Every structure is written in structure tokens, then in C-alpha cells.
Amino acid sequence: WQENKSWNAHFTEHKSQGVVVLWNENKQQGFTNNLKRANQAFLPASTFKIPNSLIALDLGVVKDEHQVFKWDGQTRDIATWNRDHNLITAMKYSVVPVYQEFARQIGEARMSKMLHAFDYGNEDISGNVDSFWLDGGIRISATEQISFLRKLYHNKLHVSERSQRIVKQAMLTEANGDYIIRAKTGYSTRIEPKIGWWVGWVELDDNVWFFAMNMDMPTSDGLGLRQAITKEVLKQEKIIP
Ligand SMILES: CC(=O)Nc1cccc(-c2cc(C(=O)O)cc(-c3ccc4cccnc4c3)c2)c1
Ligand SMILES: [Cl-]
């Protein structure tokens, strides 16, 4: 591991504070601007949709990435939530109510067992089964996110290969002739400190770079900084053009 406080400039310039953690898979080396915060545990918020999707798929709660989850007809304040969704769009638009139904059908017992099998965070689902990742007891650090993401990438999690391929498909965020990004955003507001997440990885021709970042997010106005700051670090380290 190596600490590179020069990255702190990317947060300071936006009057923000946070951590970026990078892992070079070929060289098995990690890099971060803040070793302490890289190991501080936060609510996973919507980044939990990764493990939740894996479990729902492996148990048959979700048949496949085409199954339609019909809008329940309750108008919510995020327009894209008031519509039918499948796994792909539910991930893309971080559709909480779809994933809350997943968790209810999963149930406490199976959720707890699977999170321990995943070695996911503190593996603590204390709270309500349909909201614990937003205001319950579960916590995960940036370094712990990378550990989990690396297992998913290599199909080494204790679910089927199919379940892992589908979730990695649903994580697809950006792709061009230079790189592919599979990732999931998060926004934790119910428990202080309010933070934004972005965790995932960058696929190159002959390497993969895992990343996990969180940053202080007092207002939703700064949510775009999650990706922007992360990409500035990637550019600085010459991982992307
Ligand atoms: C119910 C609960 O626990 N909330 C929660 C749970 C899971 C995900 C999110 C969430 C994620 C994102 C994201 O990942 O980008 C963005 C927003 C969000 C929220 C408010 C906004 C206001 C103006 C403009 N844009 C906004 C955007 C919310 C919130
Ligand atoms: Cl894909």
C-alpha cells in the first residue's frame, strides 16, 4: 500500500473531503490519499445494490435481467422511479423501492448468511430488512469495497457464475475504445456524515484497476463530483486518457 496525499488537491479544489482508493490488479498494489479514511466504515447506501442483486438472483427472487418489476403506482419524488424497471434500469437509476422488495423476499435469515459468505463489510443487517443499508447497522469501508469487488470480478463469490455475470452486466456504466467502467454509485443521507460513494473498476486491454471512493456530500448538488473527482485521479495516474 502507498499513500499519495497529492490527490487531496482534487477534493480541496471543490471544498470537499474524501478518499479515493485504487488497486492495481496486475501488480497487486493499492493507492489512496488517506489511509485512515480508506479504512473508515460508512453506510453502503445504494452501493449495496451490488450484493443485493447477487443474492436476489442466486435465490431466484430475480429470474434474470429482463424480468419486469412493475411500478407500485405510488408517486415518488424521483421521476425515473415512477415506472416499470428491470435489473438493468433499476441499477442504473438506483431505484430503492425495487431493491426494498428484493430484500423483503430475500428475508433476514438468508440476507445475513449471504453477507457473511461474501465477507461484506461488518456483515451486520441490524435494522429493518428493507432499509438497513440506508439507516441500519451495516457498514463498509472503501478498502473493504475493493476486496468484495475483486471477488465479484473473478467470479469467486459464493454464488453462481451466472449470478455474478448478470450483476457485472448491470454494473456497466461507461465503455469506449480506451476503457470499460463497471461501477455503482451511492448516496448516504439518513445517518451522519452524509457521503457519496462510487465503487467499481476500470477494465483496460491488459489490466484492471479497482476503485472505491467516498466524499462528504452535505447537499445533493455535489453528486456529480463522485465521478468527476474519481476520473481526475484516474487521469492523473494515467489510467485513462
Ligand atoms: C430513500 C433513501 O434512502 N434515499 C436514497 C437511497 C438510495 C439512493 C439515493 C440517491 C442516489 C443518487 C445517486 O446515486 O446519484 C441520487 C439521489 C438524489 C437525491 C436527491 C436529489 C435532489 C435533487 C437532485 N438530485 C437528487 C439525487 C438519491 C437516495
Ligand atoms: Cl457487459
Curated annotation (Swiss-Prot):
<feature type="binding site">
    <location>
        <position position="49"/>
    </location>
    <ligand>
        <name>a beta-lactam</name>
    </ligand>
</feature>
<dbReference type="GO" id="GO:0008800">
    <property type="term" value="F:beta-lactamase activity"/>
</dbReference>
<dbReference type="Pfam" id="PF00905">
    <property type="entry name" value="Transpeptidase"/>
</dbReference>
<dbReference type="InterPro" id="IPR012338">
    <property type="entry name" value="Beta-lactam/transpept-like"/>
</dbReference>
<keyword id="KW-0614">Plasmid</keyword>
<feature type="binding site">
    <location>
        <position position="94"/>
    </location>
    <ligand>
        <name>a beta-lactam</name>
    </ligand>
</feature>
<protein>
    <recommendedName>
        <fullName>Beta-lactamase OXA-48</fullName>
        <ecNumber>3.5.2.6</ecNumber>
    </recommendedName>
</protein>
<dbReference type="InterPro" id="IPR050515">
    <property type="entry name" value="Bact_Transpept/Beta-Lactamase"/>
</dbReference>
<keyword id="KW-0046">Antibiotic resistance</keyword>
<feature type="binding site">
    <location>
        <position position="46"/>
    </location>
    <ligand>
        <name>a beta-lactam</name>
    </ligand>
</feature>
<dbReference type="GO" id="GO:0017001">
    <property type="term" value="P:antibiotic catabolic process"/>
</dbReference>
<feature type="binding site">
    <location>
        <position position="226"/>
    </location>
    <ligand>
        <name>a beta-lactam</name>
    </ligand>
</feature>
<dbReference type="InterPro" id="IPR001460">
    <property type="entry name" value="PCN-bd_Tpept"/>
</dbReference>
<comment type="similarity">
    <text>Belongs to the class-D beta-lactamase family.</text>
</comment>
<feature type="active site" description="Acyl-ester intermediate">
    <location>
        <position position="46"/>
    </location>
</feature>
<dbReference type="InterPro" id="IPR002137">
    <property type="entry name" value="Beta-lactam_class-D_AS"/>
</dbReference>
<dbReference type="GO" id="GO:0008658">
    <property type="term" value="F:penicillin binding"/>
</dbReference>
<keyword id="KW-0378">Hydrolase</keyword>
<keyword id="KW-0732">Signal</keyword>
<dbReference type="GO" id="GO:0071555">
    <property type="term" value="P:cell wall organization"/>
</dbReference>
<feature type="modified residue" description="N6-carboxylysine">
    <location>
        <position position="49"/>
    </location>
</feature>
<dbReference type="GO" id="GO:0005886">
    <property type="term" value="C:plasma membrane"/>
</dbReference>
<comment type="function">
    <text>Class D beta-lactamase which confers resistance to the beta-lactam antibiotics, including amoxicillin, and moderate resistance to cephalosporins and carbapenems such as cephalothin and imipenem; in the DH10B strain of E.coli. Acts via hydrolysis of the beta-lactam ring. Has oxacillin-, cephalothin- and imipenem-hydrolyzing activities.</text>
</comment>
<comment type="subunit">
    <text>Monomer. Dimer.</text>
</comment>
<dbReference type="GO" id="GO:0046677">
    <property type="term" value="P:response to antibiotic"/>
</dbReference>
